[PDB]
Amino acid sequence: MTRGRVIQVMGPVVDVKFENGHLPAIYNALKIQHKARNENEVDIDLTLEVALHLGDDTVRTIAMASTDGLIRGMEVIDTGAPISVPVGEVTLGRVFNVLGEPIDLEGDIPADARRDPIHRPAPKFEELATEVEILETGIKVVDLLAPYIKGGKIGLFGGAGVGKTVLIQELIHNIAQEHGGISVFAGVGERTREGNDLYHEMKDSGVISKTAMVFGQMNEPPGARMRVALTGLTMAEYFRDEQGQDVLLFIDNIFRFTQAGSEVSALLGRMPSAVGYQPTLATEMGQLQERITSTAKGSITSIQAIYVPADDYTDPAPATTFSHLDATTNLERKLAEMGIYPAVDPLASTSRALAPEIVGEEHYQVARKVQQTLQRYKELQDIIAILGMDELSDEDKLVVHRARRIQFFLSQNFHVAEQFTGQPGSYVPVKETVRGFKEILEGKYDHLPEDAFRLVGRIEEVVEKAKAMGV
Amino acid sequence: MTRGRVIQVMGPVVDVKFENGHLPAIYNALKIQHKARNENEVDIDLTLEVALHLGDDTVRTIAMASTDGLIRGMEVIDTGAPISVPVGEVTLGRVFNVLGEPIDLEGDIPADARRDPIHRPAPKFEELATEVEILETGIKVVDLLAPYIKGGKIGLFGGAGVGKTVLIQELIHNIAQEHGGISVFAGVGERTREGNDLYHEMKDSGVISKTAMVFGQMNEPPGARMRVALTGLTMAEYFRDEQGQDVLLFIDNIFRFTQAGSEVSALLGRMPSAVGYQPTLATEMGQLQERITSTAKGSITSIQAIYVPADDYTDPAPATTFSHLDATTNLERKLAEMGIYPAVDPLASTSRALAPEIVGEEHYQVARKVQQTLQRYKELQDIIAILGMDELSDEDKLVVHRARRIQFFLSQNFHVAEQFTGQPGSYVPVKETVRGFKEILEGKYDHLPEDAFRLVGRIEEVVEKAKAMGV
Amino acid sequence: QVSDVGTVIQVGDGIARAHGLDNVMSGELVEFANGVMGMALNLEENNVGIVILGPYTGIKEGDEVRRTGRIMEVPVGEALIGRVVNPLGQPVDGLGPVETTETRPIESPAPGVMDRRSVHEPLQTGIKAIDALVPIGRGQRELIIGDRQTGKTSVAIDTIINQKDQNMISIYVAIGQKESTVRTVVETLRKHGALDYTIVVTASASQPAPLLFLAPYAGVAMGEYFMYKGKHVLVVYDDLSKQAAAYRELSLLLRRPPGREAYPGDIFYLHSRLLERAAKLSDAKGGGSLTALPFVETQAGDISAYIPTNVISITDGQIFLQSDLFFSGVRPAINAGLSVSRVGGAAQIKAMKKVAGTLRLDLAAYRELEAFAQFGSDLDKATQAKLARGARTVEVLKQDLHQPIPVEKQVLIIYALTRGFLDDIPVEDVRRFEKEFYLFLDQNGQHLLEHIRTTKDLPNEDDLNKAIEAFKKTFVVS
């Protein structure tokens, strides 16, 4: 094993030279650890990722930290293996970066902890699972309009609307309470304040003791945001293939992953394409998302909020992710145009779980009734806009009667951030919520004020709060 | 005693290679003199300017002429000094090209006259004027909506065939004859016949006595269309520096200056921006516009008629020159078509002269109310076009009825407009403009026909017009 | 003496290509043997692409550069208070050069994630609309965007001026601002008396693109030293659009590949470094705090553009200004519909949290119903009361220029019943009503607002219901 030399630097892209014979392969982890020779120099500690072979015994790499301080002629140490992250019952509760260094600040991982490669091919078709298990999320809207397939993949792609972060934060707590399985939350480009708030919330709640997270500072060079989420996937892979206990995973964003990769891929890349994006965006994203799949041994279920620039879904970067999600909540404005939040589009959001033979038709009948009563408003809203008088030239009668009032009964209050709004709330299962659904569809409480069906927990809560609120 | 030989000739861009170490500095006028050595050659006395140093003792230059007849191997003469212009009181009443040589058939300036190289740095901080006073013109719209600050900058954006030159000429008529100080007109990239049509007109009028005129027209090469503005601006800066007199400054079309870069810089080897404009567009425009400032030693009131290609205000050329003007008026082709002049946009044109603390509280009130009415009238066009007129409320029936009167009372006839039609012009005071807008505002003249307010000056003219017409 | 001396080959467009420098370290400062500065950015295989800081006329071929090994630094210190400086530190208004010697690297690591806190300290902006509807903490990153002359600079001026009775230091960074306008702003600041704490850094149009690029970094670096001291620092930008334009021009000159709309790839990795060096520092690193208000320009509020799309995803809150509303009579044209704030509630006092929790709902409902009733013929009169109340409460949310209204006087006017008291002639009463109410409180009921100042929460409403009744009786109807 010999050493290498640095030749040229452009932005975060850094070139490395090597002798013949000991040339490292692609995706190998290259590490630089020098010291200052004299006063005109500054100490540097940084690691690199191999991308290309340009011939002439040269290799083009990228960085994982700030490149300020790199000087031509440095000695480059080759490890020979891809970046490796500790796995096992050592990582439960810690806070890791892209390299695997625990910034949790309690201590440093032992040098012989089981370290596994980040990059490897996804599991093959030979054994992929097919069972459809439904998860009771405990939120009426997600359980009704498009219930989540526990084991597949769920994606709150919201078209980059405001109102996702809070939803993921609430889902963490309530789903973890539902099933105390292993949980992992990874952020590919983070509002550092939001990341710290989530860490403090988890530590206060106590669920941090049975979870593990990796945070990518959005100020880090695009190498970290390109290769961060694979750390969470690797840890989930370990916890699935080592103990069989079913694991649940979160992703804060994927579009920022694509963008951060795209910038470097175009800087050193062959040529641009699309709207200035990568040439290999589809393959890069497919190799990542295709690893999150339920298997014969165990199941991985993930929640990924997706950013969509300018609220235009024709963007290829999210447009290519649709095939990788089995339950899509197209939030868009998510009724932030109305006072309502964070409701998911009541008709556009779709999933695989909408089937009488998958959910049991006892819920499908109620889903039918709710769909029919609530879809007709916007279907005739553009007409009632002009015909907004007291006239009845339109047979929109019961739709105007119900639509807004029952849309108001599409928001939960049990564990909201009272620091952000202040309202209390109580938990609700869909099993007992179907009773309130049948009651509202048959119209027992059509005489109650519309403001009394808004921001409420359960049907008994609605009726009692309505009776108390201005009778 | 340095000599060079031409190497590479590309259109109006010419290369020269000099002796080692003895290169001329950047921005030094290079003269090419030659005599026809046979029947198959042409005499050439041509000038260049240093642009880039591109390695191996090479110099890449730009030319101020057609570059026709250059032969690879022609000898090069270096003057070692930038493009100089005759400067001082000698040039009053004269006309010059970009190079600083007269063309008015009045012989020539003596060869020993004082002269100054064009390029120079911008003023510092301590010598910038802070106070604001209003320079009034006589046109109702500019007098009221957006006053012209003396000692600031005024720009007149407009399309092709909207009337920026007419506005400039009428402003000359209104201001120049009644000021008493040095005046400078530096035509750049305009219709060439305007040179005659303005020179003989000013000679007939008499204000030619104490004016300076610089003519770089369209047919001239891109180098000339670049440097003509700088020549005129140095000629005006001399009088703002050394004599302290109040100096006026006109620029027919400063857009051509920044456009000629789009023609040259492609040959110079720079890659383009999203639009064909050069990547340095910001720097050249900034370094030119910064030399037009008010110092403790004098006052410059510059009027610069910026042209907007394709009527696109998202074009970088207008979209980045907004920050360099303290007052402006935008000319609307749509308003021009439907019979309003000078077709000054009342809602898009703004300025920092408009403030209640300066023009008066009642003046500010009148301006705000006019803007309110015009804004609502502009907004209601969708309703008017889609579902008739009398579907509005009772109030809007009067809001539109007054806005239609206002946008026509803003019209006027000009002394220059005496040549397009025989009807002469008028001269209006600001006090009576304010009072007339008031009397329209409280509906004193809503009974008069709406279309009778076109082509008037002060309110007495429209009164006597409604009197004279039988209706 | 030991050094590594280079050789300048190509000069043009403020760019110099140097060959040699066997000991060249990326990002260092270098001089061109003419007293001018320079920076090294593109360390190609056999040449160094140096970026020229300042005038480049005097440089030619053959000049030799001298290494310095100095990471690009800017002086900081307490003597900078009240100073207007070039990003290198030298003042532009004479007054003698800078005095403090403490320096910091322009490119420095951002504060760690574990060292931050849930920002729970309000900021007293003093403008009614932004105060009530879009709160600002002491470490938040609010974004302000809009069209030209929609009042963004006026909002910045009001925000910086209102800091007259707090422990705040305000840092102004005017990127691309015209020099005469910068002088006018300095004169206004001196006339209002805010130079006792303000550090203003200016970069004219005539300044080179490298300086226009480095100016915001210099400002934030100056802010960081005061941050670690334990103070609170406010940093206000200008024309990050022009900052991005300058960086795009530089990247195109250095022959880097261009991305979409000619912007280089690392624009986002640049803006993230620019913005994410502001937060709240816990006691573990000193109880400091720093908030920033980057500004972005746009055409008619069109947020489809690449730079606004890159910026809005970073900032914790976006403030929209629209000339459409601004010409309509809403002088502080805060578009309350599309303006959000990810620190809502926790950035408002225990009184504003009580009173303003319904005002945004009422305004949204007013716009919701008036969208249906953009025409007022044969409307359903049952819902018209809320339309009237929204119309007569939106009138409250505006104030004139150079008028900082204190939160204590603001909370009474935006009280959840003050949005719903008499309003006998609301179309014209309320404007003079609020001024006469402030004078009435300051001459008669100063104790009422003294309780609000001392408690940060509402007193018993009857104790102030009496004052409201007395003021209604005394005030002359209109």
Ligand SMILES: Nc1ncnc2c1ncn2[C@@H]1O[C@H](COP(=O)(O)OP(=O)(O)OP(=O)(O)O)[C@@H](O)[C@H]1O
């Ligand atoms: N104030 C005005 N009164 C009457 N007619 C006007 C007025 N302004 C413009 N016009 C009409 O519009 C025409 C515009 O002529 P002008 O040469 O000024 O065009 P322009 O828009 O400045 O374009 P360019 O400079 O490219 O020729 C005039 O010839 C005249 O017919």
Ligand SMILES: Nc1ncnc2c1ncn2[C@@H]1O[C@H](COP(=O)(O)OP(=O)(O)OP(=O)(O)O)[C@@H](O)[C@H]1O
């Ligand atoms: N709320 C307001 N009250 C009073 N005057 C205002 C208000 N907003 C803007 N103005 C005035 O309108 C003009 C707007 O200019 P200003 O530079 O302050 O705005 P801007 O949107 O920041 O513009 P710029 O494009 O230069 O950044 C000024 O004359 C200012 O005095």
Ligand SMILES: Nc1ncnc2c1ncn2[C@@H]1O[C@H](COP(=O)(O)OP(=O)(O)O)[C@@H](O)[C@H]1O
């Ligand atoms: N569940 C919710 N309940 C109430 N307000 C909400 C909710 N979700 C979002 N909001 C509104 O949006 C803000 C938070 O938006 P956030 O979810 O952080 O946006 P993003 O996902 O784009 O980061 C809150 O302060 C509030 O104004």
Ligand SMILES: [Mg+2]
């Ligand atoms: Mg988020």
Ligand SMILES: [Mg+2]
């Ligand atoms: Mg014309």
Ligand SMILES: [Mg+2]
């Ligand atoms: Mg402004």
